[PDB]
C-alpha cells in the first residue's frame, strides 16, 4: 500500500510545483487596461420551427448555415440570412443531446440517450438525406461529438471515457480513458491535434489524438463541469460549472488564471463560448439569461435577455459576426 | 426584389413548415409514460414499448437500465403525461420515491403507483408526497392494469386540457 502513499506524495509535489510557478495574477496586470464598456445587442433573427426543447446547435464553416436538434426527433438545417429551412432530417430516436457540422459541409452527426452516433450525408445524388453510418460501442449516453475530417470524429460518453472513430470502417481506433465521472463536455483545438474534456468530477483533462494519453489535468471547481470551450489561440480554455462559476485554465502555466462569479447570479452554467478576438466570453445560465463576461477582467459587461426559458446551447460564428442562442422555449435567436 | 431561385427556396421552406406541422399534429396524439422503480408481459438506453388500447397510442419508456447519475438526464423527461412508479427493503424504495416525487421537474406530473395492513402502507406512500393539490397518486393492487392506466391517463389529460383552456 506504499504505492498509493507515493502517489499522494507525487500529487503534493506537483501541487507545490504549481504554487511555485505562480508569481503574479491576471487581475493585477489587467487592472491598468481600459475596459470594454456596456455591450448592447438585439435579436436580429428569430428561427421558429421547433416544437420542443432545443438541446444543441452548431455553425457551419461558411458561417451562414446552421443545424439544430430538438426532442421532437427533428434535426433542422437553417439558412441564417433569410431564415429559410434547407433540410429537416427525422431521427430514429428522439432523445438527442448533440449536433455536429462537418467542416467540409457534406455530413452532420447526432447522438444522445441511444448510445450511438448517427452520421448523415447531406449531398447525395438522389436528392434526399440518408444515414451514412451508425457508430456503436459506448456503454453510456453520448454527451458530445465533433468532426475532425470527413473520416474522423471524436465522441464523449458517460462511460468516463472518450473515443476516436474511423467513419469508413465504423470501428474505434483510439480510446482516451482516465476520467472518474461522466464526461459532459468536449472541445477540439484549432490545431485539431490537441483535445480537452471536462467531467462530472471537478477535473478537466488534455488529450493527444495521435497517442491517446492524458497530457495534463486541471482541478479547481467544486461541482460538475457542464461546458468547456477552447480559446481562439489554442493555449488556454474556459470551463463552466454547475456552481455558477467560470474559470480560465492555461496549457503552459497549468494553473487557473481567473474566475467569473457574482453574488447576484447563483445557478448552473449550460454553455460557454468565446469570440473572434478572445476578449469576450459568452455564457448561458439556468436563470433564463446569457451573461456576457469579459476575459481580461472579471467584470460583467452585458446581458442578453430574450428567452422565456433557460438557454441550452450557444454558438459564435467563425468570422465573429453573430451569436446564435437556442433555449428550452423551442426558439433560437441570432444576436448581433 | 426576390429572384426566381429565392422564390422557389421560400416555397420549399413553406413545404418544410407544412410537413413539420403535420408531423407535430401526428405526434401529439400519443401519450408517453415513464416507467420507474414486469407489466410489459401483457399488452442500450431507452427501450420504448409501443402499444395501443381503446384507440390511443401509448409509448412506455423504460430507463432503468442506465447505470449513471439520474440528475443529468431525468430533465429530458419533462412533459411526460405520467410517471408509472413500481414498488415490490421498502425503505430504499420509499427514499427514491420521495426523491423522484419532490423533484423540481416533476412538481406537476402525475404519478401512478403500482404494487406487485395494506391501508397503512398505502396511506404512508401517498403521504410521502408533499404537494397534493395539482398532483394526484393513483394506486392499483396488481386486463385490469391496462384499463386502470387508460383511465388514469384520461383523467390527467382531461385536467391538463381544462387548465390549458383556462377553465
Amino acid at each position: 500500500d506504499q504505492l498509493r502513499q507515493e502517489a499522494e506524495q507525487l500529487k503534493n509535489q506537483i501541487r507545490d510545483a504549481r504554487k511555485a510557478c505562480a508569481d503574479a495574477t491576471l487581475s493585477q496586470i489587467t487592472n491598468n487596461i481600459d475596459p470594454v464598456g456596456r455591450i448592447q445587442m438585439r435579436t436580429r433573427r428569430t428561427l421558429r420551427g421547433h416544437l420542443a426543447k432545443i438541446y444543441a446547435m452548431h455553425w457551419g464553416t461558411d458561417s451562414r448555415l446552421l443545424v439544430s436538434a430538438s426532442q421532437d426527433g427533428k434535426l433542422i438545417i437553417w439558412d441564417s440570412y433569410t431564415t429559410n429551412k434547407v433540410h429537416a432530417i427525422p431521427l430514429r430516436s428522439s432523445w438527442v443531446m448533440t449536433c455536429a457540422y462537418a467542416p467540409s459541409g457534406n455530413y452532420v452527426a447526432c447522438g444522445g440517450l441511444d448510445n450511438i452516433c448517427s452520421i448523415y450525408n447531406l449531398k447525395t445524388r438522389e436528392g434526399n438525406v440518408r444515414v451514412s453510418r451508425e457508430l456503436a460501442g459506448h456503454t453510456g449516453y453520448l454527451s458530445c461529438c465533433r468532426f475532425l475530417d470527413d473520416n474522423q470524429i471524436v465522441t464523449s460518453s458517460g462511460d468516463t471515457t472518450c473515443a476516436l472513430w474511423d467513419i469508413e470502417t465504423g470501428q474505434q481506433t483510439t480510446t482516451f480513458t482516465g476520467h472518474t465521472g461522466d464526461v459532459m463536455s468536449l472541445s477540439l483545438a484549432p490545431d485539431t491535434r490537441l483535445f480537452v474534456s471536462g467531467a462530472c468530477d471537478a477535473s478537466a483533462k488534455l488529450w493527444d489524438v495521435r497517442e491517446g494519453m492524458c497530457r495534463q489535468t486541471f482541478t479547481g471547481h467544486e461541482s460538475d463541469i457542464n461546458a468547456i470551450c477552447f480559446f481562439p489561440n489554442g493555449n488556454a480554455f474556459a470551463t463552466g460549472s454547475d456552481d455558477a462559476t467560470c474559470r480560465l485554465f492555461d496549457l503552459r502555466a497549468d494553473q487557473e488564471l481567473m474566475t467569473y462569479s457574482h453574488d447576484n447570479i447563483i445557478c448552473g452554467i449550460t454553455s460557454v463560448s468565446f469570440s473572434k478576438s478572445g476578449r469576450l466570453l459568452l455564457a448561458g445560465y439556468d436563470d433564463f439569461n446569457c451573461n456576457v463576461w469579459d476575459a481580461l477582467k472579471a467584470d460583467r459587461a452585458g446581458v442578453l435577455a430574450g428567452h422565456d426559458n433557460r438557454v441550452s446551447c450557444l454558438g459564435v460564428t467563425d468570422d465573429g459576426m453573430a451569436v446564435a442562442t437556442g433555449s428550452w422555449d423551442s426558439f433560437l435567436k441570432i444576436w448581433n | 426584389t426576390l429572384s426566381a431561385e429565392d422564390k422557389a427556396a421560400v416555397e420549399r421552406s413553406k413545404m418544410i413548415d407544412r410537413n413539420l406541422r403535420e408531423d407535430g399534429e401526428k405526434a401529439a396524439r400519443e401519450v408517453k409514460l415513464l416507467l420507474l422503480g414486469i407489466v410489459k408481459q401483457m399488452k442500450t438506453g431507452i427501450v420504448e414499448t409501443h402499444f395501443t388500447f381503446k384507440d390511443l397510442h401509448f409509448k412506455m419508456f423504460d430507463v432503468g437500465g442506465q447505470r449513471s447519475e439520474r440528475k443529468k438526464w431525468i430533465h429530458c423527461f419533462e412533459g411526460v403525461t405520467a410517471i408509472i412508479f413500481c414498488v415490490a427493503r421498502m425503505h430504499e424504495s420509499m427514499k427514491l420515491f420521495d426523491s423522484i416525487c419532490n423533484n423540481k421537474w416533476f412538481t406537476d406530473t402525475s404519478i401512478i403507483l403500482f404494487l406487485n395492513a395494506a391501508a397503512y402502507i398505502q396511506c404512508q406512500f401517498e403521504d410521502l408526497n408533499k404537494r397534493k393539490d395539482t398532483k394526484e397518486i393513483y394506486t392499483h393492487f396488481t386486463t385490469k392494469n391496462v384499463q386502470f392506466v387508460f383511465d388514469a391517463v384520461t383523467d390527467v389529460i382531461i385536467k391538463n386540457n381544462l387548465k390549458d383552456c383556462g377553465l
Partner: single-chain antibody
Amino acid sequence: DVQLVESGGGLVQPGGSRKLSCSASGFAFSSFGMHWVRQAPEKGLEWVAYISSGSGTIYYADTVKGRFTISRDDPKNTLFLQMTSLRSEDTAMYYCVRSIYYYGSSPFDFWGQGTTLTVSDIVMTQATSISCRSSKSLLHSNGNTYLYWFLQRPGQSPQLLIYRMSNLASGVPDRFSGSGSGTAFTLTISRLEAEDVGVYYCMQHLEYPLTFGAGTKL
C-alpha cells in the same frame, strides 16, 4: 442511377391534340421541379413550361401560352404535357429537365432523352474560349449572378457544365472554367481532347421566361 425517359409523340395532323409523357426513376421525384425544353431541327433550345414542387406554381412560354398545359402525377412519378391546336412551328424535339432550388443547389442537373414530334425578355447573343453576352445585367443584389452553361455532344442530350458562372457541376473535370463580369461571360477549356466536341449554350435564370443562346459549335 437516375433515369428520365420520355414517351409519346409521333406524326399528327395540324389542329390535333397530343399528349407527351415522361417517367422518372431513381430519385425522389416529389422534391424536384420540372421543365419542358424543346429544340427545333434547325434552331437551338427553347424553354416551354415549368411546374414547381407540389404543383403550386406554373409558368408557360409566351408563344405556347393557352394551347399547352403541364401537369405531374406524384404517386406514379410521371409528367404530362397536353398540347392542342398544333401548327408547323411545333415540329421540335422535347426534353424533360429536373431542377431543385435551395441554398447551394445545382438546378438543371439531369436531362432526359427526347421524343421527335412532326406536324404537317432578356436577349442572349452567341454570334461568335466561348463568349456569351446578355442584354441586361444578370448580377443580383444578393451577390448571385445567374448564367448556366450546357454542352450538347452530337447525337446526345445536353449536360450541365457550370451553374451561376462559377460553380463546377458534379462529375465534370476540373479543366472547364467560367468567368466574366455583368453582361459579358466567358468559358475556358484548358486542353481539347476527344468527347469535348459539341454545341455550347448559355442560359439565363433571372426572370422565368428563360432565353437560350444561339449556340456555339466547335
